[PDB]
Design a protein around this ligand. Structure first.
Ligand SMILES: [Mn+2]
Ligand SMILES: [Zn+2]
Lengths: 346, 372
């Protein structure tokens, strides 16, 4: 019954994505005036002061900004925050790219062959397939073929996953990227997860759409209008959407001493189910066996959700966040958590 | 209206001091079994070194709680799950917004004086402590324990009237507002003095005990001498639970023995000031900080300070109560004892956690998953 999902500050305004009483996502931008402040934000922190009147507060405005957000939350949300995840749009994605090994995401030279994107709300795996990626043109994926045992020419993708798939073929990357951007537009994720999304997936999709669809298409992702990056691996920031890499969440809260943290290693360890063995080379897979390629893409995207159903690290994230009355990204930072508590303790 | 002051475990029981509904402090031993736990705590001894932690989870049945609770002893006294055990109690017991009233929280701070040939090494504790001023926020009174006889010199009683007089009249210029709240108590000997100090603690138990360097000097010296003069059994009386233990840490902090008085949170004001004031000073001595914050200072002294009791014991005692009142003055400006209480009750954790981002983050993980 009313809780935040995103808290942004554009101008001296607070753009906030939320979920009101009737479990529906909405948006209400507000020109907010902070109650408290911390002199030291002009280990080590400081006591939050309290403006007795909106007068001395206004006399203080403009003369970091995260206290603004924290102030907004504490003010607009007083008392126990109660939430239900069913209205929180959690989406993860795993993209596929064929080309010279480790297609550097900063350069983004090669096309994207596939993009499965699960969306927790409608519980569907949207599969984007470019059966025309420069390296070749290949056949449509067989939702009926990918099931029948390997005693045949199929990959044993469980029926459950397949029932939830929505396949979408494209003969050119450009037309494919155009649709993906359209899906985020149609269904803006609250939290965007994956396994190494921060390292590969995200930067790649960005630098790509940039290099192709140009800067303006890339900003379609951020609801408020802009995507930044720290740039040698560079990382992207889609304002309005919390990007929480599951690999990081796993290393931080799983407490498992595994010799490897590849998705296959963790998935096999957690879910026990594996993925059908290879068959010859590796990268050539798309041409030397498309269809299995795509089935793999979806399988990988499901395993993240599978690990989560066991671990519940997305639950933890919301729980810590709403209890400390802070933005989603703060849960992985002891400092940012402590800092949230100091401010909200008043 | 009903809030905790201390949460300790004696055995597999929780012993808590709390403020009831009539502002009356109280203690209760509760047979308790946690409803949640963290698998990583009965192992993770070197992991936030790695920065790792883990999600909490409910015990399916009481049989499981008992199993865990029994592995605890198999693990030992200072077991990590123990802190979660206290966290579980707080969360289960105070399942709602905590309404605390500082008025009912006894904060005390002291400052001792030890005249000696060489620096009074706390671990050594060989020189007689010849003065102790102990302020108590509930009484709002300074308790001055003045030793008149030592191996250093017999001396005359302190003069409340000369103390207020100007330096030219041979006075100490200590404010009357302070002098009005003093409760002077001269002693013919140390044994008598310390025995009376212990009795003060037992009679007026601090919730929070502050000072300035009380952790590294005062507390250790006080404890080490009581032990050496009145024996271990007597020093244990400082704890409402009889548990008082030393800890020899080190390096840039030095091979410093520090003490723990279970039942009382010892929070050094020097630390709070270092973590929360946010001021760069070339010295964090009481004087530099006090001057800088309150704008007032102590009167200069033309003469060897290390001989001040022999040369001017009147000024010696006045300086002592000025120092003790300086901490309360600083706190009056800064408000750090209040921040500690607000953080602790919000996060629903013990007072001591508030000091580290790690310990705070840690209690949030545990408590966010509906720990109650
Ligand atoms: Mn991938
Ligand atoms: Zn894959």
């Amino acid at each position: 019954d009313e809780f935040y999902i995103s808290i942004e500050t554009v101008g001296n305004n607070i753009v906030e994505r939320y979920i009101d009483e009737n479990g529906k996502e909405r948006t209400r931008e507000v020109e907010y005036l902070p109650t408290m402040f911390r002199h030291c934000k002009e280990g080590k922190n400081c006591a939050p002061q309290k403006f007795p009147s909106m007068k001395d507060a206004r006399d203080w405005m403009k003369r970091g900004m995260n206290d603004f957000k924290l102030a907004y939350i504490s003010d607009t949300y007083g008392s126990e925050i109660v939430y239900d995840r069913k209205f929180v749009r959690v989406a993860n994605c795993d993209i596929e790219v064929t080309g010279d090994k480790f297609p550097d995401p900063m350069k983004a030279e090669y096309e994207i062959d596939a993009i499965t994107h699960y969306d927790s709300i409608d519980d569907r795996f949207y599969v984007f397939d470019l059966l025309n990626s420069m390296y070749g043109s290949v056949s449509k994926w067989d939702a009926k073929l990918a099931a029948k045992l390997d005693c045949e020419g199929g990959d044993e993708v469980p029926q459950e996953i397949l029932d939830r798939v929505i396949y979408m073929p494209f003969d050119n990357e450009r037309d494919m990227l155009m649709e993906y951007i359209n899906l985020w537009e149609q269904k803006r994720p609250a939290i965007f997860t994956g396994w190494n999304i921060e390292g590969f997936d995200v930067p790649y999709i960005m630098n790509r759409v940039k290099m192709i669809l140009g800067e303006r298409s890339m900003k379609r992702f951020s609801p408020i209008g802009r995507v930044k990056s720290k740039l040698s691996k560079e990382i992207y920031s889609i304002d309005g959407v919390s990007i929480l890499d599951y690999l990081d969440l796993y290393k931080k809260f799983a407490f498992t001493n595994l010799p490897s943290f590849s998705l296959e290693s963790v998935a096999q360890h957690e879910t026990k189910k594996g993925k059908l063995p290879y068959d010859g080379p590796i990268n050539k897979l798309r041409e030397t066996n498309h269809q299995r390629y795509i089935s793999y893409n979806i399988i990988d995207v499901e395993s993240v959700q599978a690990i989560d159903k066991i671990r519940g690290f997305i639950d933890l994230v919301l729980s810590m966040s709403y209890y400390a009355k802070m933005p989603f990204s703060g849960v992985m930072s002891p400092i940012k958590t402590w800092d949230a508590i100091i401010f909200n303790s008043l």
